[PDB]
Design a protein around this ligand. Structure first.
Ligand SMILES: [Cl-]
Ligand SMILES: [Cl-]
Ligand SMILES: [Cl-]
Ligand SMILES: [Cl-]
Ligand code: NA
Ligand code: NA
Length: 232
């Protein structure tokens, strides 16, 4: 099976560098772009950059151009990201992933803990947390600052991250269920306004939900909505 394997944690000092690894297996490493993504509680997910392992070509989010360096080692099928000049602002989980919906695949993420005791499209999710009782409906809005449509298709996806699990694709192009996603999920919307619906909610559905656009570079994500079960 296709896997992207990342170390669990790195505990590091301010001002150091750290090298994160993403060991791939189960597919031809050289032939598919890999992306790196930063997650924090308050900013949700942030696209760092991408590398094509076949030739080593990279693209970076302007905001991470000085912070991140992406490389690839074809001999070990491993991609690497170095974070330089670490500060408290770099404490976060970092994932490697294939982000195009049709190739969706995520690593489990490396927690980097920086420890010293002493015109982009914006996506807004609403609500940012909610508790719903078993059997009831959850409805989550994602609104974009500009249109994410092209040729009648919406370049927006929803991701789910269940507790302790990697993120996964839930719905692609606004309204299509990814393979293996249960029918209780549905997605609607176009243009700037999108909605995820889940009904009837089950215990397995407790997770954080993120929307994402990939109409324009850089790809951007909403800040996340955490859904819990409201215990009766
Ligand atoms: Cl670049
Ligand atoms: Cl809200
Ligand atoms: Cl179902
Ligand atoms: Cl948000
Ligand atoms: Na390989
Ligand atoms: Na609102």
């Amino acid at each position: 099976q296709e896997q992207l394997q990342q170390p669990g944690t790195e505990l590091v000092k301010p001002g150091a560098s750290v090298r994160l690894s993403c060991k791939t297996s189960g597919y031809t490493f050289a032939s598919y772009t890999l992306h790196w993504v930063k997650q924090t509680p308050g900013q949700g997910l942030d696209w760092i950059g991408a590398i094509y392992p076949g030739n080593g070509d990279t693209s970076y989010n302007q905001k991470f151009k000085d912070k991140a360096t992406l490389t690839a080692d074809k001999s070990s099928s491993t991609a690497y990201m170095q974070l330089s000049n670490l500060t408290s602002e770099d404490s976060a989980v970092y994932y490697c992933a294939r982000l195009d919906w049709y190739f969706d695949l995520w690593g489990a993420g490396t927690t980097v803990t920086v420890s010293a005791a002493g015109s982009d499209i914006v996506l807004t999710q609403s609500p940012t947390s909610l508790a719903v009782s078993l059997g009831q409906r959850a409805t989550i809005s994602c609104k974009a600052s500009q249109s994410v449509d092209y040729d009648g298709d919406s370049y927006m996806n929803w991701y789910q991250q269940k507790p302790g699990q990697p993120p996964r694709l839930l719905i692609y192009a606004a309204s299509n269920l990814e393979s293996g996603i249960p029918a209780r999920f549905s997605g609607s919307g176009s243009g700037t306004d999108f909605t995820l619906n889940i009904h009837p909610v089950e215990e397995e559905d407790a997770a954080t939900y993120y929307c994402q656009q990939n109409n324009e570079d850089p790809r951007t994500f909403g800040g996340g909505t955490k859904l819990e079960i409201k215990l009766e």
